[PDB]
Amino acid sequence: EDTPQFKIDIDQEKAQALGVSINDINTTLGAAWGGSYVNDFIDRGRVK
Amino acid sequence: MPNFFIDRPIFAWVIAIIIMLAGGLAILKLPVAQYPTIAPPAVTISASYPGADAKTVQDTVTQVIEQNMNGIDNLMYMSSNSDSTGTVQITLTFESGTDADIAQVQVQNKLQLAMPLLPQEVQQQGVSVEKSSSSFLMVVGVINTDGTMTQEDISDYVAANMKDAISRTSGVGDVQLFGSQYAMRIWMNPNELNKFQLTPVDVITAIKAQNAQVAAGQLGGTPPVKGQQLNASIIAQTRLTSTEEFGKILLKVNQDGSRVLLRDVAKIELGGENYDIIAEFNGQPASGLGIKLATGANALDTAAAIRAELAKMEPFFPSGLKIVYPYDTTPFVKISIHEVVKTLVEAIILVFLVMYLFLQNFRATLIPTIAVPVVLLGTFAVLAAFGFSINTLTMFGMVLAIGLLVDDAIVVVENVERVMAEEGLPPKEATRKSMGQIQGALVGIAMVLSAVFVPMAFFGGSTGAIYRQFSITIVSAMALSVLVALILTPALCATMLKPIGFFGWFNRMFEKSTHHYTDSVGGILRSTGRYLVLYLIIVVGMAYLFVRLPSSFLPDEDQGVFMTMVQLPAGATQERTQKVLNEVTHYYLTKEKNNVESVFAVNGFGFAGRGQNTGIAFVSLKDWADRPGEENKVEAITMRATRAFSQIKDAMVFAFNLPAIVELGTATGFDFELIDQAGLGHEKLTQARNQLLAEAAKHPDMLTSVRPNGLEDTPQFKIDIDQEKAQALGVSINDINTTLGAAWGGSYVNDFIDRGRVKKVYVMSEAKYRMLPDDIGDWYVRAADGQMVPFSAFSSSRWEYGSPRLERYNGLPSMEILGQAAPGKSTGEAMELMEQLASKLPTGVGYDWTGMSYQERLSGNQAPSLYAISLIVVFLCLAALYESWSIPFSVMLVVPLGVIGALLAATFRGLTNDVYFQVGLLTTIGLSAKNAILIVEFAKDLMDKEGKGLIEATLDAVRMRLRPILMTSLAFILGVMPLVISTGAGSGAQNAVGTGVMGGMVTATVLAIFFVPVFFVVVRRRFS
Amino acid sequence: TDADIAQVQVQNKLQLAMPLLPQEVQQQGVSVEKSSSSFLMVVGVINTDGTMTQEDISDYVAANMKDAISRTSGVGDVQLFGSQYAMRIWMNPNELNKFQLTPVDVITAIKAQNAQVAAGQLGGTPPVKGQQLNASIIAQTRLT
Amino acid sequence: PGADAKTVQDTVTQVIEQNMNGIDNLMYMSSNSDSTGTVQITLTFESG
Amino acid sequence: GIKLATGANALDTAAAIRAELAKMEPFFPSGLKIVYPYDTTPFVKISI
Amino acid sequence: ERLSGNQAPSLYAISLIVVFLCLAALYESWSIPFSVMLVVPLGVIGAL
Amino acid sequence: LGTATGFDFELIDQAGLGHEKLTQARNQLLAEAAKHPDMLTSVRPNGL
Ligand SMILES: CCCCCCCCCCCC
């Protein structure tokens, strides 16, 4: 069934007024509230 | 076997009913198409690199893809062309019989491993691998008579809703669009860029950054804290939708504080993805839709369903938008099928009439009218079993086999009736003995005709697929006819037959003619020796006619539509080619009002390569009912159009008719590839091509109209960037190149979403700022600091010649030559002459044969070997039938008698030696051989069983075989007479079949009745 | 089992891992081949005049007679006993240090000045009304 | 990832389903677009 | 070194390779010649 | 299930036709298979 | 095919032991196999 959703409105002009790029804004929003797969590592001989 | 079914009529009826039910089910479940798959499977890779010339496209895409096209099974060859529009077109042709699905997926998976090597723009545009099939079914057209919306608006309307509904029709799911949907066009302006110290790179970066989808996770997502109760998704910034939203995109903020938007610096609109193609329809804008046909689908049903779906969609259309059909030959297929079925039913009716005319027995006249349809339905069932379809070739094979079916059904009943008359026996015993006399002859005939028809389905190459249809159709028809004449016809004769004033006179005159014929045959057996010389003269004349008759592939016929190609000189623009395409459509809609129904004029899509100086206008004529006379046919219209277009000299306009198969044609023509194999270069290969063309022009007796299938070098504007001067001024190379390409070639940056459909976003200079070399002075590129260095400072301009279309064959640079053999000489020695001429070229230049000359070269010698095998097997079957090694020669000497008549008929009517003529010739010689088999079998049976003398036996044999031969010949001539006299509505095939068949049958019937007796007598006396 | 379906399935699964590989691996080229372990044959090429070296012969073989052999029906794999030509740039640490340059600077300059760039057209569509000439614009080409 | 069902449907599902035509022996085709961004299209072919 | 694809025929493939080399030979530079230091097909032909 | 319900009458008709034709062919009469086909409804009502 | 007396053993690192433990196990197995010359001939590791 239909679900409520949370919407974030980002004002581009208000962001560039303060000196923050939209790219790192999107990166910090996505990486904080959602997962951010960075790269791999080796745990016990397996790539995770 | 016939004895078994005479005692069991119910079993024969059950077998006939089973055959009829199977045939009816097959007819209800057989795909229908105009032609089957003939060309070998081909897979085409298309790539787009917008803004690049032929050489950049080649070096960056074509070579990279070709060097990775290895490890693919059954590859015959590959050939690519790179166009100056930024298009890669690579066609890989495979062996015949290889399923194209596995070949296409192999090509796709082999290309997908070369994608990381391609430029980012080529990957971003996409590389499409698709099967080059000839399933082209119809061309829907959507026009705008109201004149409100442009071609782009029609194209977007077609793509948005009509395309999806059409692609879900019962039938095909593959469709193509003669246009492109909307795209957000940002037309920059160099003056505003210079005023605000901006560059197209800044615009591209701003558009990329401020129109994108970003992931944002969700609130309450796992792993959650203890006691969490709410879980909602998070929606961050989404893609832009409206033109105004793109207008608000901020490029930079000014020192004082003012805001710079795209609207201040560029014009934002909803344009087309590309403007290279402008489609028209009788002078007004239109958008097309090319519709193919799915495999195993009914063409008629598919077309009807598509038309019904378009009619259903019609009510919810905006103002205007009439659905037109500039190119559609569904009615051609339906008309041809109706003509074939009419020919079959008329043949059955004529069989009824002839049987009642000769045999005044109503019950007997009808035994063949309920037996031939059984064989026809069995043939349909066999075609369904073998996986074939209902197409022109199969139905013409059926109308060719109808004569032999009639031949069998008439012979059986005629001999049964003759036995009933002469012997005076009840129907059961009469048909029992009658079958005894002709049952071994009917089994030998089946074997001989199988031996003469089967070894033509094994021809290699593209034409082998054409011959296989006729071969399998006729051989199945003959096997089923023999089975029916052994099973059902004896039972019908046993049961139905009843024991026994114009018709009286007819009987009297036929008896007098039979007596005169017997006297003549008796006379010519005493004067034997002159007739052998006459037969030798006939053979020599047959050889002369065969070596004199011109050859072809298939008769081009009036399909109701034809094309016109316009080719302006190099460097011509689109508006210059649009004027000529207006001079052409005005002529067609003015000087041909009563014959032309519509003209579809595609601008920029030429025949020898897309561009701006090329175009094609294809013309749909009215129905064949509205075009009476030979002067209203496509052949008589195209010549008039070409004569009228000879006057316009600024372009090269040529009107022509479509071939029978779009994938084939020019049977006398040849395709030649001139390859360089030492890295010589483009210009050395061009010089070699020019030298070879001059040498070919020095041989007018053999090679006619040899031309290069390609484009000559054209001027190009070279911009040379000084690296030291650019670095001194502090301007980066990747900025100069980026601004140049984005301004003059365009740049697809990202996608947006409007009306629930993803569309592209293009940035390009406004038209007025990218038209002339001096417009280069309008563009400034920002240096390392806030400067705006002019292009002029660090660059120089030049004009130099370059190739607008570079083609490669099998991975090496090549040039294409199209040639035609001389009218009086075949295309085999023309290839030899071309090889001899190419052998005298500069070192490092080799050659190759491609397309249909590739098939000829390797698969052009199957026919003599297969015919020799056929003749050997025919000898074996005949010797087995006659229990003698010499008797089959008498049967085999009826071949020139049937060939000479077909040759004479072909020469008299001006016809050529096509596939239809060859299959009709085989049919005629098969029927004549069958008659000879029956006559010789009867004669030798009279010799053996009754101990009669040679002359007496061979005279009684022809006396009792005269009537069936005349009956079957008259029935077959009257059956195929309308095919000879037929004009329009696919009459080329009908004439090509009927003329040859009728001439051969007439001559064979006239000659065999006199030559088989003397042949048998000479064989019996010279030997033994 | 038929090797066609096996190969298409293997490539279908490998296209998932393809984005996860390093860019260098993708540039070199990942290949999926259905063939035997042992060589069907070995075709050697020599020079009787003694002018061509091992490098020249191997480059000629790879450039002119390896691609065509690879497309021969039934040939599942070709191994070149050598390597074709390439622009080898042997950079000197001492002279790089003398001019305060680094290998990354050399790579950047080569990428910049060895490009095959698309510069567009003169009078390309959509053209302004009254356009008369249409010509391609060629800016930069691969070094040769 | 990062697109809800509505913005992923017309983005990927509608453009893939429209090209899923012309395949022989196909009985029906269903699809679903989750809010996570994952999209699943199932084409069920004729038996045999 | 040529390895034949799985399921192919080892003799017609060798014939095709020799045909390709025969086509290649006329355009060789001066002194360049082709030798066959390894071939498993002639043994097959002589055995048959 | 809907497909199976739509083909049962056709299956019955084809089976009856085939049995009738086989009986007529084997017993060399039309009256014998016609009389045999009259007993089929008895078995059918028994199964029902 | 190999020889009739040949075998291709393949020692697997089922756990997350690592390369050193695996090669120690291989060396131990090779030493143990060298103690039965009457049954095992030329037991060698294929790798480097
Ligand atoms: C009666 C002679 C038959 C010999 C051929 C056997 C194969 C045909 C089967 C049909 C019933 C005899």
Ligand SMILES: CCCCCCCCCCCC
């Ligand atoms: C694909 C090859 C098919 C050829 C089949 C030959 C058998 C024909 C038998 C017909 C006898 C009535």
